[PDB]
């Protein structure tokens, strides 16, 4: 017959404690606060933003994603005049796969990179401000509607939504929504 004890509970809890999360979990932990704030300001799903950031940056390990560039989404151009040049792959039916130098935005931190993603979704590309409307929280009943909307639009990749959904459930990213 079980006997309840707070002292024992605390001792068990501490005995089970792990000192360090996986690099994957640590990456999520490092951007979740800013994602919640920005996604509230732009009315988007934080779970979808965090999943996108992990996917597009390889858990923050790509050369663009880590310091001192902080460019999680591999956005081309500059940010307030700042940029970094590096080789990137391009494809054309004409030449095939080939490398080329491009300029990528350079941010002060991950925060401004996340904000660019939020602006992109909410404000849209210049030719259609409502392009990502299906990922707006006021139009998407669940995050699955949002990810389904990004597929074919944000990236050409017919399993894009499925990848985002897998990240979201595997790390319970809806806790942030």
TrEMBL record:
Localization, UniProt: Secreted
Protein name (Swiss-Prot/TrEMBL): Lmo1076 protein
Lineage: Bacteria, Bacillati, Bacillota, Bacilli, Bacillales
């Amino acid at each position: 017959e079980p006997v309840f004890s707070l002292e024992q509970n605390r001792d068990d809890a501490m005995a089970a404690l792990a000192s360090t999360p996986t690099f994957q979990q640590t990456f999520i932990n490092s951007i979740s606060t800013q994602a919640m704030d920005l996604c509230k300001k732009y009315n988007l799903y934080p779970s979808v933003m965090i999943a996108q950031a992990a996917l597009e940056s390889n858990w923050g390990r790509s050369e663009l994603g880590k310091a001192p560039n902080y460019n999680l989404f591999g956005i081309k151009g500059s940010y307030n005049g700042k940029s970094v040049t590096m080789k990137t792959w391009e494809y054309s039916d004409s030449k095939g796969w080939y490398q080329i130098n491009a300029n990528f935005a350079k941010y002060p931190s991950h925060k401004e990179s996340l904000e660019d993603n939020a602006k992109k979704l909410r404000n849209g590309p210049s030719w259609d401000s409502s392009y990502y409307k299906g990922a707006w929280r006021e139009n998407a009943k669940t995050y699955k509607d949002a990810t389904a909307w990004l597929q074919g639009r944000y990236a050409t990749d017919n399993t894009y939504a499925s990848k985002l959904n897998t990240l979201i459930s595997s790390y319970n990213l809806t806790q942030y929504d």
